């Protein structure tokens, strides 16, 4: 992606999210906050 996380583009920016799935539910995984199905979704940082 354009804006990843400290863990590189191996996972997505959101710490509470892992990178697999989508808020959409139409893909397998993502690497940015654009696909985070948990994007600041209550469990934003655990
Ligand atoms: Zn994510």
UniProtKB/Swiss-Prot annotation:
Q: What ranges of residues constitute the CCHHC-type zinc fingers?
A: 3-46
Q: What does this protein do?
A: Binds to the promoter region of genes encoding proteolipid proteins of the central nervous system. May play a role in the development of neurons and oligodendroglia in the CNS. May regulate a critical transition point in oligodendrocyte lineage development by modulating oligodendrocyte progenitor proliferation relative to terminal differentiation and up-regulation of myelin gene transcription.
Source domain of life: Eukaryota
Q: What is this protein called?
A: Myelin transcription factor 1
Covered residues, full protein = 837 to 880 of 1127
Family membership noted in the UniProt record: Belongs to the MYT1 family.
Tissue specificity as recorded in UniProt: Isoform 1 is more predominant than isoform 2 at all stages of development and adulthood. Expressed in differentiated neurons especially at higher levels in newly generated ones.
Positions of Zn(2+) 5 binding = 12, 17, 30, 36
Where does the record say this protein resides? Nucleus
Report the domain remarks.
Answer: Contains 7 zinc fingers of the C2HC class arranged in two widely separated clusters. These two domains of DNA binding can function independently and recognize the same DNA sequence.
How does the annotation summarize its subunit structure? Interacts with STEAP3.
Name its species.
Mus musculus
